[PDB]
Amino acid sequence: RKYFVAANWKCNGTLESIKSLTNSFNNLDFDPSKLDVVVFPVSVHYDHTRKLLQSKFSTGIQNVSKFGNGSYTGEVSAEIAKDLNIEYVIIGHFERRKYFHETDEDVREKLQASLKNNLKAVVCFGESLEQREQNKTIEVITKQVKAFVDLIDNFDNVILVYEPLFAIGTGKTATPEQAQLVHKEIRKIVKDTCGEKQANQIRILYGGSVNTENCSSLIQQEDIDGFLVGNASLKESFVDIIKSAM
Amino acid sequence: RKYFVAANWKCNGTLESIKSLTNSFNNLDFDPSKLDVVVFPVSVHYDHTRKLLQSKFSTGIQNVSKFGNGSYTGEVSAEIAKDLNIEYVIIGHFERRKYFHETDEDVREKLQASLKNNLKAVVCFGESLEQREQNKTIEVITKQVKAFVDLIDNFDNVILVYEPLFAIGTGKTATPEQAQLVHKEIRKIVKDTCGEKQANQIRILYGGSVNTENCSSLIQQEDIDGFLVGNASLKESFVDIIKSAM
Ligand SMILES: O=P(O)(O)OC(CO)CO
Ligand SMILES: O=P(O)(O)OC(CO)CO
Secondary structure (H helix, E strand, O other): OOEEEEEEOOEOOOHHHHHHHHHHHHHOOOOOOOEEEEEEOOHHHHHHHHHHOOOOOEEEEOOOOOOOOEOOOOOOOHHHHHHHOOOEEEEOOHHHHHHOOOOHHHHHHHHHHHHHOOOEEEEEEOOOHHHHHOOOHHHHHHHHHOOOHHHOOOOOOEEEEEOOOOOOOOOOOOOHHHHHHHHHHHHHHHHHHHOHHHHOOOEEEEOOOOOOOOHHHHHOOOOOOEEEEOHHHHOOOHHHHHHOOO | OOEEEEEEOOEOOOHHHHHHHHHHHHHOOOOOOOEEEEEEOOHHHHHHHHHHOOOOOEEEEOOOOOOOOEOOOOOOOHHHHHHOOOOEEEEOOHHHHHHOOOOHHHHHHHHHHHHHOOOEEEEEEOOOHHHHHOOOHHHHHHHHHOOOHHHOOOOOOEEEEEOOOOOOOOOOOOOHHHHHHHHHHHHHHHHHHHOHHHHOOOOEEEOOOOOOOOHHHHHOOOOOOEEEEOHHHHOOOHHHHHHOOO
16 A cells, blocks of 8 residues: 555645745755655645646645535535646545534445546544443444445545544544554454455545654554654654655 | 735646736736725735736735744644734635635734734624525624624724625625625625724625726725635736726
8 A cells, every 4th residue: 555644734724835835845856756745735725836846746625515516605516626727625524523513424424526537535534432431433434435336436546544633632642553453443344344355455544643753653553554643744844754754 | 995906826836827917917007195006816826926026016825824923734824924014815715615614713813813903804604595585684794794793993904805605606696786795795794893993994895706807897895895806816917907996
């Protein structure tokens, strides 16, 4: 499996900081045929970032609409995306499930619209702190994954991301072992419902807090194929997180 | 009052159709100091559209976030908008209230974030078909307006838009008279809660279906100061709607 390292800038950035940040990123020398590195800027920053990042870096948007072109003020459709040649899109990030009540149904439809338009998808899912304490982690994960996994046709174009919400912002910590356990169960769910060749091909990223110090012990895990970095991706030291996967 | 004519492209467009459409728009000769004409493209199309449209045309985005910079995947903040020099933003469009459950609280917060960052706002509100039949039109509007009207400081930078939802997609038609009545009640709500100089200064646009044939009889109304055009703005004949307000 080809490692995958994504930078989710979320809602941050100014024309200037981005110029500076990309300038750092460009310096890192790596083979894009051996590693996937994707940068997800704010929609209105897409063109700007794309012109500054060299071809070795892929780019994409943080969200895609579940509807197609039409009367949907404020949305961006997979079609619009395809036309601009955006390559990846993030789907189901917990922040959207939390503040915008995006449901598993939305996730499914968005994924469908994306695949139909030849977009690659970074699909997110994970259990809450409350669900983890109730030992429902696997039950929850299974449900969420089984909500869209059947729509996956090409397992090189859909990247799954496990976002242990429970650890993110609660004073908790997901250890390389804990994550490796779930990453194994997810991969098993794919195997049982899509076949082995597929399960061994699909990539499952860790989406909890990742930084220059813990990235190595994470990428080392068997079923962890890279990550979806958050705040760390806003620093120049992000290049080291990439190096950890070279 | 300086007339206002806005083009809400919603979720439509391709790099090519936009080049063609703007080419048409550019041809129309008008004085921007006498008339406000604003185009709202898809976020990912903003730069492209802005480079093609001549200075006489203002541009803005279809939606703005209620949060500031930070962990809000998929959102665009007023701060980021300001940095890019985006001038206007649409807030509360019924399509967002309908499909994304944006509430009057979201509208207030979004408006606040916008004003704090020196952005001009196009605020939308309107009653449903069901509420109109129950003769609750004035009641509903008053509520929605009284949800943010106090935050208005500079009455040249906030444009109110009445979107008679009822007439949009039900087989109903809002006559120039019907709209003119509501526009009068809205302006009175501003007068009683913000004063006369303000009420007489703020622009109140009509948001129902507008086309080359009914625009004139609408702009003629006393309390109608322009419009927020939808599908008609996707045609080259949109220039005639502009002319109707010159
Ligand atoms: O938790 P942080 O520091 O915001 O960053 C993330 C995710 O959201 C790490 O992959
Ligand atoms: O109803 P249409 O044709 O989509 O256009 C609109 C609004 O949404 C007219 O201002």
